[PDB]
């Protein structure tokens, strides 16, 4: 039987906060140092030189993977 | 001193017991609790939404 009619209180208080980072926030990426390329030399069958900026080059990279390439002041 | 006017009530206040009872009713206290709850809840919601 029913004796009464009432209004339904509830305590919805969130007072605690637990947020956990999903895994992919910590995954790696590939980051690189970046300087302005002053020049480039490519050689595979035939050598080719491109010069963007002529200055005394303070750093030089050599990379052999497919074609021989030399990145000047890179 | 020159400007003051006393009601009878402010005089009875001095010689008299102190009430342990605010005039707040059962139902009035129900609504107080509900109001506080509702406002607190919406403020926490709002702040989490800014975060």
Experimental method of this PDB entry:
cryo-EM
A47: CB partners within 8 A, 6+ apart: A41
SS (H, E, C) A11-58: CCCCCCCCCCCCHHHCCCCCCCCCCCCCEEEEECCCEEEEECCCCCCC
| Partners of residue A14 in chain B, C-beta under 8 Å | 41, 44-45, 48
Q: Greatest CA span in chain A, whole angstroms?
A: 99
Nearest CA in chain B to A17: B48
Whether residue A61 contacts residue A70, with contact meaning beta carbons closer than 8 Å, is answered with: yes
B3 touching A (Cβ < 8 Å)? no
Cβ contact (<8 Å) for B48 and A15?
Answer: no
> Collapsing DSSP states into helix, strand and coil, what is residue B13?
coil
Q: What is the resolution of this structure in A?
A: 3.1
């Amino acid at each position: 039987m029913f004796l009464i009619h009432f209004v339904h209180y509830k305590t919805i208080l969130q007072k605690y906060t637990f947020k956990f980072k999903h895994i992919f926030l910590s995954i790696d990426k590939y980051n690189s140092l970046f300087f302005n390329i002053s020049g480039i030399l490519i050689w595979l069958n035939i050598i080719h030189i491109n010069i963007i900026l002529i200055k005394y080059s303070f750093f030089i990279l050599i990379n052999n993977f497919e074609y021989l390439i030399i990145l000047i002041s890179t | 001193k020159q400007q003051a006017v006393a009601d009878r009530y402010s005089i009875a206040e001095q010689h008299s017991p102190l009430p342990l009872t605010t005039g707040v009713d059962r139902d009035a206290l129900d609504e107080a609790q509900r109001t506080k709850d509702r406002i607190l809840n919406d403020s926490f919601t709002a702040e989490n939404l800014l975060i």
